[PDB]
Amino acid sequence: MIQGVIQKIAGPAVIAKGMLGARMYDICKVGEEGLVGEIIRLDGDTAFVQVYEDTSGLKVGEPVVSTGLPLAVELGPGMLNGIYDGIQRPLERIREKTGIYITRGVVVHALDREKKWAWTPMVKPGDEVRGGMVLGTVPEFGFTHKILVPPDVRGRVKEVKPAGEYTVEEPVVVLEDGTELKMYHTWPVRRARPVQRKLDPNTPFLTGMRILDVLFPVAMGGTAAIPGPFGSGKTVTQQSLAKWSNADVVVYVGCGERGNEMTDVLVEFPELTDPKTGGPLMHRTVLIANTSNMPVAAREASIYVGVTIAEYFRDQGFSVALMADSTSRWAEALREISSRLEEMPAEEGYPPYLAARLAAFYERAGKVITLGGEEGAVTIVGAVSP
Amino acid sequence: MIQGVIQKIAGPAVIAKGMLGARMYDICKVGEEGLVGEIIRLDGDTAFVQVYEDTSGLKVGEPVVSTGLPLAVELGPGMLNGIYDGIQRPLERIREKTGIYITRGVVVHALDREKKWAWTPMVKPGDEVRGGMVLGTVPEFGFTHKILVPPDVRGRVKEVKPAGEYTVEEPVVVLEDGTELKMYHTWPVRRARPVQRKLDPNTPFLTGMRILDVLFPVAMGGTAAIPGPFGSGKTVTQQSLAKWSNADVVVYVGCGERGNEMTDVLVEFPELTDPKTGGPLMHRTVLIANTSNMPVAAREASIYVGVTIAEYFRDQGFSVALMADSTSRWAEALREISSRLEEMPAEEGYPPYLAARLAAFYERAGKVITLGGEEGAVTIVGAVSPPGGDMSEPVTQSTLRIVGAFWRLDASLAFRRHFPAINWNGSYSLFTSALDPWYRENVAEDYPELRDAISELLQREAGLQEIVQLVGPDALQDAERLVIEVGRIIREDFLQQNAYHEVDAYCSMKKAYGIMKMILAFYKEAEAAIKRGVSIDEILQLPVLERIGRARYVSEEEFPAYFEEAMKEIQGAFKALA
Amino acid sequence: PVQRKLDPNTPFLTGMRILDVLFPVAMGGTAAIPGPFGSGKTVTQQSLAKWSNADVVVYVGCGERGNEMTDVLVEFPELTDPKTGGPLMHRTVLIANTSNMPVAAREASIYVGVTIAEYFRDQGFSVALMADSTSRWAEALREISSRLEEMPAEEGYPPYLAARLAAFYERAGKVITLGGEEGAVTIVGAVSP
Amino acid sequence: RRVNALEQVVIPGIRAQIRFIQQVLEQREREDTFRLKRIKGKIEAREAEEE
Amino acid sequence: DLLKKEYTGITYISGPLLFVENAKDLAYGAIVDIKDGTGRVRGGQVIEVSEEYAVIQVFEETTGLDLATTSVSLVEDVARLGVSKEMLGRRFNGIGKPIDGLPPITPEKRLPITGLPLNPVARRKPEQFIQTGISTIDVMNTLVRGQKLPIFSGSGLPANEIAAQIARQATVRPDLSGEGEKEEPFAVVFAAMGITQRELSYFIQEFERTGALSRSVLFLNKADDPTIERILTPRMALTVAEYLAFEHDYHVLVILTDMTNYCEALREIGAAREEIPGRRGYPGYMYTDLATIYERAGVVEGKKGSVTQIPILSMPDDDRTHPIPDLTGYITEGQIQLSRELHRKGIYPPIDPLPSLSRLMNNGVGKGKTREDHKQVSDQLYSAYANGVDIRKLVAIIGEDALTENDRRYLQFADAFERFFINQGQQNRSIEESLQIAWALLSMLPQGELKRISKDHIGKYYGQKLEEIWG
Amino acid sequence: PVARRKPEQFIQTGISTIDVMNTLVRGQKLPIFSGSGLPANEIAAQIARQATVRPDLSGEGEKEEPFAVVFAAMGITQRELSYFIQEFERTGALSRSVLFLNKADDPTIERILTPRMALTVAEYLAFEHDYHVLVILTDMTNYCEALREIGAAREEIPGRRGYPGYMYTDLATIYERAGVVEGKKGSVTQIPILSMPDDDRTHPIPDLTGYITEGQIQLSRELHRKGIYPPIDPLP
Ligand SMILES: Nc1ncnc2c1ncn2[C@@H]1O[C@H](COP(=O)(O)OP(=O)(O)OP(=O)(O)O)[C@@H](O)[C@H]1O
Ligand SMILES: Nc1ncnc2c1ncn2[C@@H]1O[C@H](COP(=O)(O)OP(=O)(O)OP(=O)(O)O)[C@@H](O)[C@H]1O
Ligand SMILES: Nc1ncnc2c1ncn2[C@@H]1O[C@H](COP(=O)(O)OP(=O)(O)O)[C@@H](O)[C@H]1O
Ligand SMILES: [Mg+2]
Ligand SMILES: [Mg+2]
Ligand SMILES: [Mg+2]
């Protein structure tokens, strides 16, 4: 791969040299410690890397290795009932490894590679499969988890594993050309997942609050924003929506907020009851946490990871509700990163491309017809803390 | 000529190399297409050229040739009844040559070379001539055009051609040194034309609008500015001034505004009638148009061409009025050019030399004694759209210090359709005292006293309005209520003027004097009746109120009978009340 | 440097009824007397110079109008010292600046005065220091920072204005000198919003 | 009643608006000063360092 | 040549810009194709050139580009669009490529998208009055054929519904002017900058319902599309509109969905180039750039076609002093301003008549065009409404009981004016009905105070009761 | 500063509102604050035409000493130039005065250098030949604007609002030249004139002038519109 060394350090910004051949928005490994970085500039033989972890103690001359791939998540069984870092790292494995403090340089897998899952095949040899088609089902906590072909895959199948228990990284389907399909696949978080059609929202998103349901309704597949000063009740409203709403899967994103607001959700939720299945409430919830004293550059990654997971659960036919705790912290992260690049800012120091990012993020929401034929929807409620 | 090639293109800016020998502000020909450009920088062997035409499609390596002369205009017969672009090219010739669109690289002469003019000499061989002296006479519509010696020429004459018809290229003078003089000459636009002496301003510039002529006069040689937000009425006021003023020649300059406003002038004016000659109104007007979607760099050249033509018509002996559509567009053009040069700007991004340009432009206005011994005058009215929001922008502040009158417009008055919407509190004039002797002789002996009484009433009304916001109109006593009602009467009747009405569009001086006399007589009678114990409510029910309020729409020649009848009714009504 | 800073426990007898009774200031303390123009700052400051119980008096002008500085320069020598009947100028040091002096001289005016006051403190005396119009010293500081392109913070003032003001006022206090004796410095500063 | 209403409601609101507008204008002046610093630094760099 | 040249010396990629150093052969303003290492082709435009290097802005995103394998190829020196009469009923993206699945258009001509200025001699005065079916537009802010009449809107206000209603109901009245045979329908050109799926779905449904897609041409640039593509959409739309109007004698109506997004993209490009800013953030040349878009409308001497523009833009904090509404109001020929306070009371359409303005009204009204009493009625309505608003501000302070009879009459006129004249719903009103309602409202006042109307018109029309029309 | 002495003698300007209620003293810097449309030029011309010293009231009757007026005009137009020439030449007041004129179309550096030449001449006449001189500066707003243009042309970072940081020092080197010196008989008195740009006294130019000068005279707009001349407001 492309390999080079470091010659400049200033906060979370690292400039590497000898990187001729690296591509834009790739993922690099930085230093002896092995940090995670992303390239957003190219200039001659040099590259500009923003680092998603702490850069203290680095020195000039440490090696930089490029993986050649953009920032991607692992989508598959095992994401429910889980709490993840801003770049999709399970927090309880980090607790088991390091202890009570989050140190940098820890490498963990997103999905558990050692759990056995029950597999029930659907396809037959000789069948023609396309992107987004369903091949196999796996039992989860009350749900039925479907195994989907990656969207950019077409071929014919002659190999099916029989019904048994396998891990997530065993080939269950082999295509005619030799492509092996597993229970999980990876997707870059900056690309919107394909669909067939988008539909007009026509059913309400029931929140359980009188004033929001009666006077100012939001439809299944719409977007909403809730601004207000500190102490107004944004977090309590969002947590009440997580508890009581009729969505099948709830994805909660904590972007630069208090750690207590996430510990409360972690502790209290398993004792509650799911309104529409009767099981524990935590079995339907996915948590992405990046508190305020964690690295600044990881705030953007948390938002994109959350919206990518919510898009993934839409394609299975569920109805997903996404709650972003604060987008103002994401805006502050963009301001900091642009300040390291010495770009000319717009009003209040925000970069001029700030509105484009917000437009691209909210555009992911809608009621669609999935590639497999089922109907799903994603609704987004984002809190603004000005 | 100095020749070189190009290596930089970025918008309206072109940087050439190999140009050692070029001079500042020369005219260069850019590219094989032959575009017109101007030099503003010198750096070693490279020069910086701004282009007056579009630059898309040019390639690095095309030649650049310098003409060695600055930007000049052709002054002579044939400029009246014409319309020109920013660098003095007739638009009718372009319309003949091209389609409905304006393309680049069109070459046309400013003065028509085919038309033949009647020539009548005024000199004989052996005479001594000097710069600015006349020699000849050419008829042109209702005017007699005089052929002037260029200001830089002195010598003795031995040649005259007799009376005949000749083209403008025909030279009919030969001096002893052998030089030739023609019916036209070229003058650079950035050099002010010389005069013999300046004069004090002592004659009003009659605009035909009541509030401007009465309350805020401007002299014949003075300057005025009219700032206001969009939709307040600058362009309508300027076109009314173009139609109804008593200037001999009106030069109208459009700088960065809509093309429909120029089309309106092009269509309506040939139908209208000249106030002082009875001919078509378009025979006295010259238009210079550089619309908003035309190239940016030509906006400055349009202003300079307009002021140079206005100065030229002054030297013949006329009184010229100049209307500048917007100087804010000129300022924005200067800001646009300064971005390419990478300079360090002033408060709002404008270049620091902006304030000197405006002062140099406005200083050309005045009443002079020309080099030919006659008397001429140029008066400049410049509309200043406040560029961002308001009156604190540097353009308006720089304009405030060099103008003798300041007609501030208000958006709140224009919202409620109270045109002309002049803000009376924030406006002023400095030409009142000088014009006072003229008003006593030509209008009426007591006219300044009536004007002072009207201003005193408006000030009294403005004072009481603070109390009205505090307690309401019901708490005021009867005298102050009467003052408030009379102020409302003045605002509704005297100041308001509809520019699209058939009769109200123009108002002479004596009609305004009569209306002021009627209003002051009514106020005196009302105050006397207040002293006799009459309540205010029954006074306002009088039928004479409608008689005053509709005195605007009475025609000019019907007016004296109406004035006599209204005065008699004013006397009759209040004598029977108490 | 000193040995030890003591707590203030003796009053600074200003010689005025209201200031001594209602709003006293202890020796080694700091007082501020603000007010708009025409309020009465200068008269009170000069009365403090004339009538106080301080052994040595230091008077600092941060840069005044020329005629007012002329007035205070002429008026002071004519007076008499209330302690002994001698001239008042024998116990005073005068620092004088006008508005046309170099801007570096006006900024360093209050530091020279406080340094001299600290010097007399080490000998065992009690020193009263009067600063006139610290607002004009702040203006001089603002101009110096504008010369160095210091990115103004609050209105035009540099971000470190409060640090300099803290450094100036914290020099006042009753201490035990290195020689084993006791001295004090009292600072009164006039502000003109 | 009128005096009390004017003393309590109107004057503090006007004062709050005045100070808010003053703070916004001060912020804009600070931002343009920063931009001027950057462009001066850019101008002085390209004129000397290049050969 | 047999095969075209390629340039590989690229050493800069940051944001939307891209530097190449061996490219002196590219003309200024040219269009280029940027080839990825994987075979993907992206478009770009050259705006700087030198013997040293060239600067290229990229339309699409820059993900996946690298300095070792990327190459730049050349397309023609001027951005040219192929147009035809066959393109009515088609859909296109932001850069002119089909997205309806049909084969591409065979061009009759290829025209530069930047356009050329119209000669002021060749223009003519807009004259024809257009009956939009809305009283507050027909009577007080009249729209004539050939006018640029933007709509100033807020965030939650329904500008799209008003624009769709105007496009549905717009017609001319040859009978009033006596011009003879009835017109042909308008041809609609719809250009969308960054637009959500909700607004796009609403517009598509509304055009499908009335069958207007057979006459329309749509240029769509969605919210999830690349931002720099928004530079080219209005220019391509106006090129097509100009071609249709001035070469095939159509009557074209152009709708621009949100000029705010265009200004945002323009600010992005300007800030990438370190240009001198305007007032808030926007570049100093934004006035000139907007002027090349708006000023392409009008009518031309000796031709039957016409182009009418209805841009829609959102004032950010309902603020009229923002740079975008300010420059739009300086360039265009009027504005229609929506009011949030009227919207909160359930009034539709919520047009506030006082800040609204139509500059070209006087050309299209008067006798022989609509009727003889139009202008005076409009002026009297304006003055009476202004007095009503002032009296509202007065009774906010002093109280209702302290009013006289005159102020009470003006207050009741203002309330009835809003409730009946402005609130009309989805119904279609002719000009005669609107004038009748306006005269009925003015009959609530005594004849003494309406000084702006001539006594003949008062003697003819005054005295109508509103209960006959509304009861 | 140890060479100056306290001002103690008055100057009779001939205007009641200045002579009685706002007395002008030899050695004072007393600015006139005016608006935009207010007649500052007429008041300046009247003061220059009428001002004189009164030795008979002083002492036993005193011995007479010369008097002179130095006039500086910055950024004036042609109309003001003609007005001042005609005002000074029509009554013999020119015989005792010196005029420095700078038109609006003249270069800005000459505007910068204009008041310093007037003050140099005033200092020379007062302290070499024992004259009592009176210096009048026609408009300080024009001087401040020219200073801003010159500073921006030399790539200097501006100060508080738009004006350069060293403007407070630069104005001080102009105002503080006036005064009266112990051991000498002559004195210099200054009457600056300036127009408030926003018509607000919190603008930097009026604000910095209040720190250096010793008073103010303010013209009133209401008195001007009522027909009163000269419109001096006695209260502020
Ligand atoms: N619906 C509610 N019912 C009861 N108490 C409430 C409700 N909403 C808010 N509160 C109270 O107000 C507090 C507001 O805290 P919350 O975290 O919701 O505020 P916030 O606006 O999200 O602030 P932050 O910006 O700090 O995250 C709650 O902790 C609770 O005490
Ligand atoms: N004196 C007047 N009488 C009647 N109507 C007037 C008068 N003045 C202005 N108006 C009306 O107000 C409108 C103002 O438009 P106008 O072209 O004068 O604007 P402007 O303030 O000059 O703006 P800009 O040139 O910046 O677009 C006119 O079109 C006309 O409808
Ligand atoms: N103890 C006092 N007795 C009489 N007058 C006083 C006293 N203190 C202050 N004043 C008055 O207050 C006014 C302001 O004086 P001064 O302090 O010199 O100016 P400023 O307050 O502007 O600094 C003086 O005119 C003076 O007469
Ligand atoms: Mg919270
Ligand atoms: Mg106009
Ligand atoms: Mg004081």
Curated annotation (Swiss-Prot), chain C:
Q: Which positions are annotated as binding ATP?
A: G35, P36, F37, G38, S39, G40, K41, T42
Please state which protein family the record places this protein in.
Belongs to the ATPase alpha/beta chains family.
Q: What does this protein do?
A: Produces ATP from ADP in the presence of a proton gradient across the membrane. The V-type alpha chain is a catalytic subunit.
Protein name, as recorded: V-type ATP synthase alpha chain
Tell me the organism: Thermus thermophilus (strain ATCC 27634 / DSM 579 / HB8)
Q: Which residues of the full protein are shown?
A: 194 to 386 of 578
From Swiss-Prot, chain D:
Q: Which domain of life is it from?
A: Bacteria
Q: Which UniProt keywords are present, listed alphabetically?
A: ATP synthesis, Hydrogen ion transport, Ion transport, Transport
Name the residues that span the membrane. Answer: none
Annotated Gene Ontology MF terms? ATP binding; proton-transporting ATP synthase activity, rotational mechanism; proton-transporting ATPase activity, rotational mechanism
Which GO biological process entries does UniProt record here? proton motive force-driven plasma membrane ATP synthesis
Query: What family is this protein classified in?
Result: Belongs to the V-ATPase D subunit family.
The task this protein performs is described as: Produces ATP from ADP in the presence of a proton gradient across the membrane.
Q: What is the name of this protein? A: V-type ATP synthase subunit D
UniProtKB/Swiss-Prot annotation, chain E:
Which UniProt keywords are present, listed alphabetically? ATP synthesis, Hydrogen ion transport, Ion transport, Transport
CDD domains named among the record's database cross-references: ATP-synt_V_A-type_beta_C (cd18112), ATP-synt_V_A-type_beta_N (cd18118), V_A-ATPase_B (cd01135)
PROSITE patterns with a match to the protein in the record: ATPASE_ALPHA_BETA
User: What InterPro entries does its record include?
Assistant: ATP-synt_VA_C (IPR055190), ATPase_a/bsu_AS (IPR020003), ATPase_F1/V1/A1_a/bsu_N (IPR004100), ATPase_F1/V1/A1_a/bsu_nucl-bd (IPR000194), P-loop_NTPase (IPR027417), V-ATPase_su_B/beta (IPR022879)
Q: Which cysteines are joined by disulfide bonds?
A: none
Single Gene Ontology BP annotation: proton motive force-driven plasma membrane ATP synthesis
Entry's Pfam families?
Answer: ATP-synt_ab, ATP-synt_ab_N, ATP-synt_VA_C
A GO molecular-function descriptor: ATP binding
The organism's place on the tree of life at top rank = Bacteria
Function in brief:
Produces ATP from ADP in the presence of a proton gradient across the membrane. The V-type beta chain is a regulatory subunit.
Family listed: Belongs to the ATPase alpha/beta chains family.
Per its record, how is this protein called by name? V-type ATP synthase beta chain
**What organism does the UniProt record list as the source?**
Thermus thermophilus (strain ATCC 27634 / DSM 579 / HB8)
Q: Which gene encodes it?
A: atpB
UniProtKB/Swiss-Prot annotation, chain F:
Instruction: Tell me the GO BP annotations in alphabetical order.
Output: proton motive force-driven plasma membrane ATP synthesis
Give the record's keywords alphabetically.
Answer: ATP synthesis, Hydrogen ion transport, Ion transport, Transport
Q: Answer yes or no on keyword Ion transport.
A: yes
MF annotations from Gene Ontology:
ATP binding; proton-transporting ATP synthase activity, rotational mechanism
Task: Tell me the protein family, please.
Answer: Belongs to the ATPase alpha/beta chains family.
Q: What is the documented function of this protein?
A: Produces ATP from ADP in the presence of a proton gradient across the membrane. The V-type beta chain is a regulatory subunit.
- State what protein this is by name: V-type ATP synthase beta chain
